Amino acid sequence: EEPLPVLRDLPRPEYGELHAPVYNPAEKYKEQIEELHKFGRYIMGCLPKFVQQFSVWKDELVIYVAPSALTQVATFLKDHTSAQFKACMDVTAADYPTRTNRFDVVYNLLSVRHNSRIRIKTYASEVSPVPSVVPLFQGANWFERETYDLFGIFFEGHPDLRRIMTDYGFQGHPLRKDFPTTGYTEVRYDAEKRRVVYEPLELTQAWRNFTVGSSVWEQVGDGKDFTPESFKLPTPAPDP
Amino acid sequence: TNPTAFAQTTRYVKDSTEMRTLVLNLYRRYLRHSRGFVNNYNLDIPASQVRTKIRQEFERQRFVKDLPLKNVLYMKAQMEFQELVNFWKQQCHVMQYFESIKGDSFVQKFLKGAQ
Amino acid sequence: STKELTTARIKDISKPDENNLQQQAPNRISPWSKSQKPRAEAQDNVRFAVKDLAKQPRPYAAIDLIYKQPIRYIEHDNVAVCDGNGGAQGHPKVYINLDQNKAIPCGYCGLRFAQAAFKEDIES
Amino acid sequence: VSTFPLKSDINITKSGKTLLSVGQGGRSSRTGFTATVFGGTGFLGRVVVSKLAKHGTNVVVPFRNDRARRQLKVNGDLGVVNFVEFDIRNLKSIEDSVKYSDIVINLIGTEHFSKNFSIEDVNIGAAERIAKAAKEAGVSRLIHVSSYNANPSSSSDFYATKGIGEQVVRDNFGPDATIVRPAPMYFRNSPFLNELLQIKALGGNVIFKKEVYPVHALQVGEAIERIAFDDATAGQTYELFGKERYSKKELREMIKHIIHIGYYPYSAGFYLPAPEPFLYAFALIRQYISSQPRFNVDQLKRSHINQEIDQSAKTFTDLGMVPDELSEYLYRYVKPHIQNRTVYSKEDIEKLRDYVNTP
Amino acid sequence: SGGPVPVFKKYTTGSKGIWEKIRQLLTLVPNRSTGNPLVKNYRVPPPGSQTLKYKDPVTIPAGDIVKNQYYDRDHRRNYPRLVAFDQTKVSGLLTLGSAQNPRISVGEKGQKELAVFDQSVSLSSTLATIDPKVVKSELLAEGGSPVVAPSLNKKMKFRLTEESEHGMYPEDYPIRIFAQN
Amino acid sequence: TDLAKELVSGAPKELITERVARIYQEAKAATQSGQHNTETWKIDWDILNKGNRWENDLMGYQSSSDYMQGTILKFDTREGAIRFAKGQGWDYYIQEPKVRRFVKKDYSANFY
Numbered sequence A: 001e002e003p004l005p006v007l008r009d010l011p012r013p014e015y016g017e018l019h020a021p022v023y024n025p026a027e028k029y030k031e032q033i034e035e036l037h038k039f040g041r042y043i044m045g046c047l048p049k050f051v052q053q054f055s056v057w058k059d060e061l062v063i064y065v066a067p068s069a070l071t072q073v074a075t076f077l078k079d080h081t082s083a084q085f086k087a088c089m090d091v092t093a094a095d096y097p098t099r100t101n102r103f104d105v106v107y108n109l110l111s112v113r114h115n116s117r118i119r120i121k122t123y124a125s126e127v128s129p130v131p132s133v134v135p136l137f138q139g140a141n142w143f144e145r146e147t148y149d150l151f152g153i154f155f156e157g158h159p160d161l162r163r164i165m166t167d168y169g170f171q172g173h174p175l176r177k178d179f180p181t182t183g184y185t186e187v188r189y190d191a192e193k194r195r196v197v198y199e200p201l202e203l204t205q206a207w208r209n210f211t212v213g214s215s216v217w218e219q220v221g222d223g224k225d226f227t228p229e230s231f232k233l234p235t236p237a238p239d240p
Numbered sequence B: 001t002n003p004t005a006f007a008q009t010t011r012y013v014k015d016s017t018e019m020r021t022l023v024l025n026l027y028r029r030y031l032r033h034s035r036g037f038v039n040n041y042n043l044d045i046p047a048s049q050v051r052t053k054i055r056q057e058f059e060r061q062r063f064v065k066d067l068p069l070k071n072v073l074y075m076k077a078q079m080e081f082q083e084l085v086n087f088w089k090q091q092c093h094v095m096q097y098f099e100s101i102k103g104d105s106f107v108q109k110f111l112k113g114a115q
Numbered sequence C: 001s002t003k004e005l006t007t008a009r010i011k012d013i014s015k016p017d018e019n020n021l022q023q024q025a026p027n028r029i030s031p032w033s034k035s036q037k038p039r040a041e042a043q044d045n046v047r048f049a050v051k052d053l054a055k056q057p058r059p060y061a062a063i064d065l066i067y068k069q070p071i072r073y074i075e076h077d078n079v080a081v082c083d084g085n086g087g088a089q090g091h092p093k094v095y096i097n098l099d100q101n102k103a104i105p106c107g108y109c110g111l112r113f114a115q116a117a118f119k120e121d122i123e124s
Numbered sequence D: 001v002s003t004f005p006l007k008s009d010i011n012i013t014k015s016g017k018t019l020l021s022v023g024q025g026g027r028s029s030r031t032g033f034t035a036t037v038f039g040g041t042g043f044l045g046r047v048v049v050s051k052l053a054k055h056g057t058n059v060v061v062p063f064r065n066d067r068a069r070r071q072l073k074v075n076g077d078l079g080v081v082n083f084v085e086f087d088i089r090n091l092k093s094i095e096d097s098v099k100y101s102d103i104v105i106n107l108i109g110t111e112h113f114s115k116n117f118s119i120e121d122v123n124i125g126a127a128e129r130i131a132k133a134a135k136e137a138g139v140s141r142l143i144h145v146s147s148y149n150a151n152p153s154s155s156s157d158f159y160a161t162k163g164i165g166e167q168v169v170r171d172n173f174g175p176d177a178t179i180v181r182p183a184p185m186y187f188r189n190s191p192f193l194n195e196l197l198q199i200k201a202l203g204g205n206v207i208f209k210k211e212v213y214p215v216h217a218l219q220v221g222e223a224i225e226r227i228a229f230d231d232a233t234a235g236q237t238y239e240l241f242g243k244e245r246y247s248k249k250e251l252r253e254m255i256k257h258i259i260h261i262g263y264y265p266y267s268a269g270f271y272l273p274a275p276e277p278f279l280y281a282f283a284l285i286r287q288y289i290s291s292q293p294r295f296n297v298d299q300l301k302r303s304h305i306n307q308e309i310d311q312s313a314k315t316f317t318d319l320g321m322v323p324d325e326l327s328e329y330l331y332r333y334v335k336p337h338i339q340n341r342t343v344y345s346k347e348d349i350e351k352l353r354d355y356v357n358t359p
Numbered sequence E: 001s002g003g004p005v006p007v008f009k010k011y012t013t014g015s016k017g018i019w020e021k022i023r024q025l026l027t028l029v030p031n032r033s034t035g036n037p038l039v040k041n042y043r044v045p046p047p048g049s050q051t052l053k054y055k056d057p058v059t060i061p062a063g064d065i066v067k068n069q070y071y072d073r074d075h076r077r078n079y080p081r082l083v084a085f086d087q088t089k090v091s092g093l094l095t096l097g098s099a100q101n102p103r104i105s106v107g108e109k110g111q112k113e114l115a116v117f118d119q120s121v122s123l124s125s126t127l128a129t130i131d132p133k134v135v136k137s138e139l140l141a142e143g144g145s146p147v148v149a150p151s152l153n154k155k156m157k158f159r160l161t162e163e164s165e166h167g168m169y170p171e172d173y174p175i176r177i178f179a180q181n
Numbered sequence F: 001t002d003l004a005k006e007l008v009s010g011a012p013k014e015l016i017t018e019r020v021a022r023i024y025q026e027a028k029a030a031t032q033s034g035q036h037n038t039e040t041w042k043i044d045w046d047i048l049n050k051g052n053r054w055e056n057d058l059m060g061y062q063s064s065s066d067y068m069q070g071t072i073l074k075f076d077t078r079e080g081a082i083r084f085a086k087g088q089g090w091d092y093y094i095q096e097p098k099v100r101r102f103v104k105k106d107y108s109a110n111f112y
Ligand SMILES: NC(=O)C1=CN([C@@H]2O[C@H](COP(=O)(O)OP(=O)(O)OC[C@H]3O[C@@H](n4cnc5c(N)ncnc54)[C@H](OP(=O)(O)O)[C@@H]3O)[C@@H](O)[C@H]2O)C=CC1
Pocket: D038, D039, D040, D041, D042, D043, D044, D045, D063, D064, D065, D068, D087, D088, D107, D108, D109, D110, D111, D117, D122, D145, D146, D147, D148, D182, D183, D184, D185, D186, D190, D191, D192
């Protein structure tokens, strides 16, 4: 039944000068880089008709396929035992207006089987449809519904495609780069009509674009080479 | 999982003629529900004008030539119908849709700041 | 009047009064910036029609206060070091050169430093 | 409404004030003016305040009912609609309601009298004191509102004080004071369309024989906008009314079918005919028993007077606005009191007029 | 372990004297704390009235005045470059081997071969025409075995515990607690 | 590309009829000697002849009714900008960047 200690007063460790090793954080992914490279090539060899190219970054493997190669590669990665990606976590997009097909549709698959994640990238334009993966993954029903709402991508084969985020009868797809961040209209309560009405946008304080004062010097270099020494073409050695 | 009421599958049509049959079919579906649109949305105008303004918006796109433009304008064509039937829009939105409204002389625009 | 109340001056002309609500600040009559809106014009507005101007915020003008400080005088050195008299709770440390025969104010604090040998001319 | 309430962005007043507008006319825009709507918490004030504040015109709203003014602020942006507590038995408050203004509007008026104010003190005393103070406060334009039969010779007290009220304004403010004489204004929650919809209307036959001309409350609100923003309307008198002639007895019955209300209308008390000497007596008693404004004696005399049009005054064609007929607007203002919903267009309403008068 | 702890060993207010004996006689579990913190212990020197003079911590290699060149520890600019392997480079690696396991001739004869895969080479053709041992050695693994998806955590394993060890719900409740192993 | 893609973007009609966009490459700033902000092509919209900026009466803000005032697009090839402008049916005009003329600079030139 001893009285409780006063934890404020108990002695604390004494340290002199602290030492912590400095080493490149990208080194600890070295083993993961080779194994994704091998398994990335394996998918390409199995399906040369579809896999345009594959890429590895640290611990993330990406497979680049055409829109017409989507259902095939998705099915292969779902059913093949060596790569059982039953769970699709994310369906999204990104806008790069400089490219001919601006939208870049990206899928993230999870394999609870082997504890792995794979990424599928497939492009799309404003008018060209993309196959819907809803027949394979039911979890993409709303992720495709969201991508259309914010990017206007036509998804072929979706059972019920409609707005999910923006208001009903909202004009324009917000995440397209050409859509201004403040939109086009705004609402207020009109006394005469006894109802909330839309009016064209008019900001009391116009948005200030401080992004113009960005860096005029390039800030990060060319990077470093971390490709496994088993995935570089050998240099033909000079002759005697 | 099952789709909601008045839903349709999203298929990219590849024939021009096939689309017009869908386009013409959809037009009566708008026309058929016009009285219910007034009743459900408590519109202050008779259903005749509701049928009147539906037709105009179809013609606005009549002269598109390229096919990929035709589908997307049809894909979004169905979506606006589906929301209207299921009472998803509020009364404020529908009123303002049909409550919408000659340009001033050069002096008049100049006098008031123009654009 | 409205002549001093609407134009900025380095120093005022008449003695400021704390009760006069038309002054720019309770301890200064005229504004201290060329683009500062006079307080007389600011309160001549519809939104002040039924207000109590004595209870609106009237902080003491900082220009008049800072010139009430004495000039620091440095002995046998032409460079003064100022840090806001708080170290880690002041401004960054800035070194002031006192070769010219005048009092050079600090960039942040506004304290004026000079040389002791120059005090007699400065105090004229 | 539209997109810009002005015809020009620079507007010089009678007093040498140069008002420069900024913006496109939306919420964040301004017009440079500063009005003062008296009785903005009244029926007509709410529409008038809303239109002015909708386009960035600062509006000072003197009020006495603290809660009734709260909903006025939604119409204007930050700092636009300002509130000044006042009482017409207080002069200092009125001299602050008009201190910074460039337009003064006077919607204060009554057809009933109270234990603290009579009709003489309100329709005549208040308007006079406003114009006297608005003149000494250097206001360029004053707009006044009176009844539709302003006639200082009328035996009715309402048109006796409303008619004299016109004079004492121009005799106080001067020969620049505009005057507006709207017809019975119909709108949502309007005093006119109310008693037509009220079920237990005691003395219906006595009250509803009076004939008037319907007029849109919004058009009256929009008309007042055109008057304030135009300097060519100074000293002019406006008689605002509609074209088609309607009688309350016609309306009280045309309304009856839209409401869809056999034995019931007689049993429910919809028809409550009354000998006139009783009505003069019961309305006499409620002046000092009821704590609320009831249908009083003076209002009874008005039921004996049809609307008169003073043809020497102006109309909506002077403002380039087409008056709106009650045919197209009666239905949307009875939907609150109202298978398939039965919708009446202009043709449906006019045909319904035929049925009422057909025996 | 997380075994039950006597009430007087927890920093909450507890009764004393006759009421302690009443509290133990009537409560279901006598070692349950009221939850009201000890006034004399909890936050007693407030955060604004402490005694510790804080000093900025600095590990030596990255905070030193010496042997502390920034380019040694400038990891943000040593990021891994983005390399995409198209079908052509896979074919070149497949046919010619890798940099570690060369299968290319030397000198100008080799420079002839590398230039072959410097332009488009579809991988469908490459697998059709190459030694079957190459696939079993380069593309596939362990003598023709497939390539299983790599694991993000080679140390992710689980094992079944029991209530005498995990302390949670007994065997009857419909959940099982998994350890690391 | 050739399609009238603007009919699916839901953008207001005024960007086609009433506004003018500009395709330009940002110029080098005189103050600084860096040459990196001048390597990507950008699209910006012209300001409005009235209602671009006006002073808020109450707090002195900068009110605006231009919903494209803070919209700048980025590209990496000139053609992609022109193609994208063509796709949306924008009434653009291209601003060709100036090219600095090469002049060799020698240390010895100060005396020769
Ligand atoms: N259909 C109609 O409404 C018609 C009305 N008119 C006249 O238009 C004028 C405006 O009335 P309207 O808006 O339509 O409806 P109201 O009768 O409700 O408006 C009366 C206004 O005057 C104010 N008022 C009355 N007495 C006082 C007082 N002692 N002190 C301060 N304010 C007072 C009221 O303030 P508060 O609200 O706080 O009580 C109210 O704002 C009236 O004179 C009316 O006779 C003429 C033709 C048609």
